Design a protein around this ligand. Structure first.
Ligand SMILES: Cc1ncsc1-c1cnn([C@H](CC2CC2)c2ccc(-c3c(-n4cnnn4)ccc(Cl)c3F)c[n+]2[O-])c1
Length: 236
């Protein structure tokens, strides 16, 4: 997260860190708890992932340094990638992880609600992107989970900034016109969380952008409301 600030323990309890263990263990992507055995993340995260065997899902983590050889994690039973996914920039950048056991919800690990389709005409004004990613383009994975408040952008404005890409209704864009706050490398797969009537909704999945926090280049997110039928179909 560029231009963000450190989070505190329990602040984003649906946020997980997905680690790969090949050839070494490291943070790979963010993700969101949406059910007791279900993580929603980005399909791009699994480029070069040989199988679910090498994945570990850690929940309730504030600092990456909390994760030691005895830290408990969830195994991944299945990776479900959208059938139309080809590359992040052309959409369908969404994946479900089915965990090998159920998350017991606690103050540190909690689900986030999906958007309502009856809530597709709501204007979200209180949206946040979170993650352990770079604070600038040539940086390092951060120890402490970072947060930034970022405004949503109309798809018409977003298409004007990305004339070489097809910005569709299945994407949502977010960023300041002058830049300065955005997701960056290592944040993808994590949530764009928006609060409405004091309830949090998983509105976007961090996906792609041209650089990080650049002027007039918003971040592009998978528009989760457009995938609710697909999610319910896979999780039922
Ligand atoms: C894990 C790790 N560890 C060290 S490096 C790195 C890394 C490099 N790439 N990644 C991921 C894609 C790879 C997982 C498959 C990525 C790509 C793009 C954006 C992004 C960007 N960025 C553009 N240029 N950099 N970021 C801007 C706006 C938004 Cl919304 C974004 F989602 C954010 N992540 O995480 C992680």
């Amino acid at each position: 997260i560029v231009g963000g600030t450190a989070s505190v323990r329990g602040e984003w309890p649906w946020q997980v860190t997905l680690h790969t263990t090949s050839p070494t263990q490291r943070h790979l992507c963010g993700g969101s708890i949406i059910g007791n055995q279900w993580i929603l993340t980005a399909a791009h995260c699994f480029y070069g992932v040989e199988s679910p065997k090498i994945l570990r899902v850690y929940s309730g983590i504030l600092n990456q340094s909390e994760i030691k050889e005895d830290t408990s994690f969830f195994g991944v039973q299945e990776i479900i990638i959208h059938d139309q996914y080809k590359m992040a920039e052309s959409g369908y950048d969404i994946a479900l992880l089915k965990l090998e056991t159920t998350v017991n919800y606690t103050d540190s690990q909690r689900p986030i609600s999906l958007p309502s389709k009856g809530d597709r005409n709501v204007i979200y004004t209180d949206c946040w992107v979170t993650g352990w990613g770079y604070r600038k383009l040539r940086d390092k994975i951060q120890n402490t989970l970072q947060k930034a408040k970022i405004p949503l952008v109309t798809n018409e404005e977003c298409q004007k900034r990305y004339r070489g890409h097809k910005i569709t209704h299945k994407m949502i864009c977010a960023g300041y016109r002058e830049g300065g706050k955005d997701a960056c490398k290592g944040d993808s797969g994590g949530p764009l969380s928006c609060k409405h009537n004091e309830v949090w909704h998983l509105v976007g999945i961090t996906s792609w952008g041209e650089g990080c926090a650049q002027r007039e280049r918003p971040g592009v997110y998978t528009n989760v409301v457009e995938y609710v039928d697909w999610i319910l179909e896979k999780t039922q």
